[PDB]
Amino acid sequence: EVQLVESGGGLVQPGGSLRLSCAASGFNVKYYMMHWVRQAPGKGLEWVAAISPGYDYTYYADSVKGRFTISADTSKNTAYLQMNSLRAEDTAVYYCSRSYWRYSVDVWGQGTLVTVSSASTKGPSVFPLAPGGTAALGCLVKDYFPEPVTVSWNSGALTSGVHTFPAVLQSSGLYSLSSVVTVPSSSLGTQTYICNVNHKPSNTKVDKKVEP
Amino acid sequence: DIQMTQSPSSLSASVGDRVTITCRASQDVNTAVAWYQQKPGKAPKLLIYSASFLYSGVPSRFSGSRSGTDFTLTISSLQPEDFATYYCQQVYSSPFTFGQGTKVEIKRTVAAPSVFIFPPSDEQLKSGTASVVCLLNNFYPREAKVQWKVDNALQSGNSQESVTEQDSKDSTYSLSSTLTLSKADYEKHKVYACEVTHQGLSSPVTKSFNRG
């Protein structure tokens, strides 16, 4: 399959180093221009760097020149972004992408989240939001760092009428969010409602039953 | 460095409508300009390559034209799923710069929010903190005023709002207001109310509880 797969993101300290990888499938990078593009959370697309591995020729935004090094190994069909002197400003989903010659970029990777922060990993606290004939219920997922967190309901069995809000950064510098579901009121002692919370960065899986 | 000045920064259009999105390049970039669609949580998808060529699998609604340094992206008939940020990019010379983006929202019928309030859980209070959550479910348009009153005193700078992305199927929004207090602050007051003002309500809707 024609595909790009980024890896190596995660939570890193300010001033530190992080090597991102972009693994190409379905084509060899020798014949393409490979790009790094980043998105600070809620912001637009900023182009960061590009490399033509067949000629070793490199391009950098002034925003990253000297600090960041874009490179490639054609024998590994992989491009790299070596990020150094990392700043809070460099917090972003990092996407790699492919261009042929002077044609426009056509294939993007899924992206890898880089969070630059001196703040420690912290698992969420999960608390119930207890409940015409439609009722609402949910769980508050409170006090976690960093992003992201996943919430599902009834181990993914319940999807209809679910709204997981975007996280908000509270003043303590921890995130918090609510997942909410609108259900029939007839099922408050019939059907049990569990929310499944996965905070992969802290390795915290928490399951909380909510009932009246 | 070439700037791509993208107009407008945001727009609201009904399903069926024609939508026009503008990129002005600060220098000649020939046809080496492309248009990307980015849905929430996702990587951009290529829509239009080399200024006017429709990319494979992309609906014929999407079109692109060039007038010298001015580039135009057109949706012929919107569709509820076209909710997305659209960006243009120039690949004429490094840095290969992106427009600031255009957020396209789908315009629809006014729909009043369903309002629900959730008191702090026992568990949270034992943790020593009190979070009160007000849900506005399935409303249009986005603009909604949520006020918190404890013992009938209007609060300020102690609530955080979060709002879902527009539903790609029914173009509604949901919103959370979360009031956070000390346990002591929670237990020195009796009455907790969120008061909702929205265009679909004839008058403000208040949902409230007394501790106990």
Residue numbers in the entry:
A (entry chain B): 1 to 131, 138 to 218
B (entry chain A): 1 to 212
The authors write:
One intracellular protein that is frequently mutated in cancer is isocitrate dehydrogenase 2 (IDH2), somatic mutations of which can contribute to the development of AML via production of the oncometabolite 2-hydroxyglutarate (2HG). Mutated protein products derived from cancer driver genes, or mutation-associated neoantigens (MANAs), can be processed and presented as peptides by human leukocyte antigen (HLA) molecules. Here, we describe the identification of a neoantigen-specific TCRm antibody targeting the IDH2R140Q mutant peptide in complex with a common HLA allele (HLA-B*07:02), the structural basis of its specificity, and its functional activity in a CAR T-cell format.
To assess if there was conformational change in the 2Q1-Fab upon pHLA binding, we determined the structure of the 2Q1-Fab in free form. There were four copies of the 2Q1-Fab in the asymmetric unit with alignment of the peptide Cα atoms yielding pairwise rmsd values of 0.25–0.32 Å. Overall, the structures of the four copies are similar, with the only striking difference being the conformation of CDR-H3. This is likely a result of the conformational flexibility inherent in this loop. Structural alignment of the Cα atoms of the unbound 2Q1-Fab molecule with the IDH2R140Q-HLA-B*07:02 bound 2Q1-Fab display pairwise rmsd values between 1.2 and 1.4 Å. This superposition revealed a rmsd of 1.3 Å displacement (maximum rmsd of 3.6 Å) in the light chain, while the outer strands of the β-sheet of the heavy variable chain expand to accommodate binding to the HLA-B*07:02 with an rmsd of 1.5 Å (maximum rmsd of 7.4 Å). All three CDRs of the 2Q1 heavy chain exhibited significant conformational changes. Specifically, binding to the C-terminal end of HLA-B*07:02 α1 and the N-terminal end of α2 induces conformational changes in CDR-H1 and -H2, respectively, while binding to the C-terminal end of the IDH2 peptide induces a conformational shift in CDR-H3, thus optimizing binding to pHLA.
